[PDB]
C-alpha cells in the first residue's frame, strides 16, 4: 500500500516497500522478519 510503509515496525523488504516516515528496513540478518523500525532506539540495544 503506497510507495512505502508508514506503519512503525512495518514488515518491509530491501527489494519491496521500504518505509514512509523514513524508517530503516532492518531484518534478522536472514532476509526474513524484515520490518521498518523508526528512530526511537538509536545505538543498538546491546551495542555490538
Among residues 14, 7, 48, the alpha carbon closest in space to that of 31 is found at 14
Cα torsion for 39, 7, 5, 21, to the nearest 10°? Answer: -40
- Way it was determined: NMR
Q: How far apart are CA 29 and CA 40, in angstroms?
A: 20
Q: From CA 18, how far away is CA 2, in angstroms rounded?
A: 10
Q: After which residues is the chain broken (C to N over 2.5 A)?
A: none
Question: In a 3-state reduction of DSSP, which class is residue 32?
Answer: coil
Closest CA to 34 of 47, 22, 19, 20: 19
Give me the CATH code for the 1-48 domain, please.
4.10.40.10
Q: Which residues, in sequence order, are CB contacts of 1 under 8 Å at separation 6+?
A: 17
Distance CA 12, CA 45 (A): 21
Is residue 9 a contact partner of residue 35, using CB atoms and an 8 Å limit? yes
Amino acid at each position: 500500500k503506497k510507495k512505502c510503509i508508514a506503519k512503525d515496525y512495518g514488515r518491509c523488504k530491501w527489494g519491496g516497500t521500504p518505509c514512509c516516515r523514513g524508517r530503516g528496513c532492518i531484518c534478522s540478518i536472514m532476509g526474513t522478519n524484515c520490518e521498518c523500525k523508526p528512530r526511537l532506539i538509536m545505538e543498538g540495544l546491546g551495542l555490538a
